[PDB]
Amino acid sequence: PEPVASWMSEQRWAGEPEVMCTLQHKSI
Amino acid sequence: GSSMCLELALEGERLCNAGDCRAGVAFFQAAIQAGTEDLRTLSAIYSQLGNAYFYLGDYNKAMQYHKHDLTLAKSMNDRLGEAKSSGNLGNTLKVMGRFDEAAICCERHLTLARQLGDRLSEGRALYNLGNVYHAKGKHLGQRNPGKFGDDVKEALTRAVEFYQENLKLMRDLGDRGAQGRACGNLGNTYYLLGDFQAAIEHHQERLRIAREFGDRAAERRANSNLGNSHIFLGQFEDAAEHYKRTLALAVELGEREVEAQSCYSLGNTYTLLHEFNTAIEYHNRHLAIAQELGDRIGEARACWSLGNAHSAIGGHERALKYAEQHLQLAXXXXXXXXXXXX
């Protein structure tokens, strides 16, 4: 096992997702 | 009474806003107990309870109260309200991994929005359906990492379609920040699909938009996604540039965990580049952060990498020390590297 291949493999399914909450608020 | 409920519910609302959501939930419950004749108020309390439970991680409760709100909203013929409830419930179901059900709720939101001609609501629904299918394909891929099945590709493919529909509507409406969100998620989805060139193009637009808004966090995300995309196109110098930009942003934002990951990524990328000294500086940075943060798993990865990096430059004795450090932290792999260096 090789640290670089191991790192790249972990990266395959990585990604910084958009973070905005999409819940909708009903004002009282 | 109805006025008791109202005051209790408004204090509930105010307390969730101020980030005292656990006390808020108590006020919403007192407000239900006090009772009201106004369904629009009751429905709003059910909805706020559903969101507060969502944020607190009690997804069963959130689902329960969103459903109450939904049903009450049908029963009041409040179509825009029903659409919101459906969207909220769909989101909750998505987080519970109940994707089929989530999609149905989110389609309903989309259906109502289009009936009403509410383009912004339609946009939101499209984005949410994008999120459901994106989360579904991601989940399927994780759950069986050794295969890249039709089910995964099918899920991600639907996600692409919804996000594209969203992006186009967001362009028609001129909603720049929403365009930025759609590009980011499209970029991620194409990246999971392995359409790395499509991911690049969308992450690049995402970055452009983030910069227009002075949104440093979105800039950081975009640069991180770019670095990864470049690695997956074999473009190692572009990747190094994007990771460095990521790093500079993470320092400016005080995101120490992200600073660490960017450094580890740079160590790897420079190793591929055969710039061992430069890799070693990046790995040293990652290692120091991992130590400061008590992240032992990262510390093991660092030691492993640093052992290799040092051997690569004939630093054999130093290499041995990292290998031993890796062993402690960890096992099979280090024992082999520790034996090979003797």
Contact B88 A23 (CB under 8 A): yes
Long-range contacts, B35-39 (Cβ 8 Å, 24+) = B35/B1, B35/B2, B35/B5, B36/B1, B36/B2, B36/B5, B36/B6, B37/B2, B38/B2, B38/B6, B39/B72, B39/B75, B39/B76
Residue B149: HSE in the Cβ half-sphere, 13 Å Cα cutoff: 15
Question: How was this entry determined?
Answer: X-ray
Residue B20: HSE in the Cβ half-sphere, 13 Å Cα cutoff: 11
- Asked if the C-beta of B47 comes within 8 angstroms of chain A's C-beta atoms, the answer is yes
Cβ atoms of residues B175 and B123 within 8 Å: yes
Taken as a whole, chain B contains a residue count of 342
Cβ atoms of residues B307 and B323 within 8 Å: yes
Contact A3 B188 (CB under 8 A): no
Phi/psi zone of residue B45: left (φ > 0), alpha (ψ -120 to 50 degrees), beta? alpha
B278 contacts: CB under 8 Å, gap ≥ 6: B270
Q: Which of B127, B228, B333 sits opposite A14 (nearest CB)?
A: B228
Closest to B169 (Cα-Cα) out of B135, B109, B120, B110: B120
Contacts of A13 in chain B (CB under 8 A): 138, 141-142, 145, 192
- Asked if the C-beta of A10 comes within 8 angstroms of chain B's C-beta atoms, the answer is no
- Asked if the C-beta of B245 comes within 8 angstroms of chain A's C-beta atoms, the answer is no
Contact B41 A28 (CB under 8 A): yes
**B221 min Cα distance to partner chain A (Å):** 6
Interface of B with A in 153-212 (CB under 8 A): 181, 184-185, 187-188, 191-192
Task: Write the CA distances from B304 to A5, B231, B270, B288, B311, integer angstroms.
Answer: 12, 21, 16, 14, 11
Contacts of A15 in chain B (CB under 8 A): 187-188, 191-192, 225, 228
- Asked if the C-beta of B28 comes within 8 angstroms of chain A's C-beta atoms, the answer is no
- Judge residue B250's burial from the number of C-beta atoms within 10 Å of its C-beta, 0-12 exposed, 13-18 middle, 19 or more buried: buried
- Asked if the C-beta of A9 comes within 8 angstroms of chain B's C-beta atoms, the answer is no
Contacts of A20 in chain B (CB under 8 A): 181
Contact B13 A8 (CB under 8 A): no
Phi/psi zone of residue B235: left (φ > 0), alpha (ψ -120 to 50 degrees), beta? beta
* Structural domain spans, chain B: 1-342
Give exposure, B195-213, as e/b (b: 16+ Cβ within 10 Å).
bbebbbbbbbbbbebbeee
CA distance B43 to B57: 21
CATH of domain B1-342: 1.25.40.10
Following CA atoms B331, B335, B338, B340 in sequence, which dihedral angle do they give, to the nearest 10 degrees? -140
CA distance B116 to A23: 20
- What is the 8-class DSSP label of residue B292? H
CA distance B229 to B246: 13
Cβ atoms of residues B40 and B61 within 8 Å: no
Residue B340: HSE in the Cβ half-sphere, 13 Å Cα cutoff: 11
H helix runs in chain B, sequence order = 2-17, 21-34, 39-55, 59-75, 79-95, 99-116, 119-143, 150-173, 176-193, 196-213, 216-231, 236-252, 256-272, 276-292, 296-312, 316-329, 332-340
**B23 min Cα distance to partner chain A (Å):** 16
Q: How many CB atoms lie within 10 A of CB B142?
A: 10
B332 contacts: CB under 8 Å, gap ≥ 6: none
Q: Which of B84, B185, B305 sits opposite A26 (nearest CB)?
A: B84
Following CA atoms B128, B129, B130, B134 in sequence, which dihedral angle do they give, to the nearest 10 degrees? 100
Task: List the structure tokens of B90.
Answer: 């769909």
- Asked if the C-beta of B228 comes within 8 angstroms of chain A's C-beta atoms, the answer is yes
Rg (CA), chain A: 18
- Asked if the C-beta of B136 comes within 8 angstroms of chain A's C-beta atoms, the answer is no
What single letter denotes the amino acid at residue B199?
A
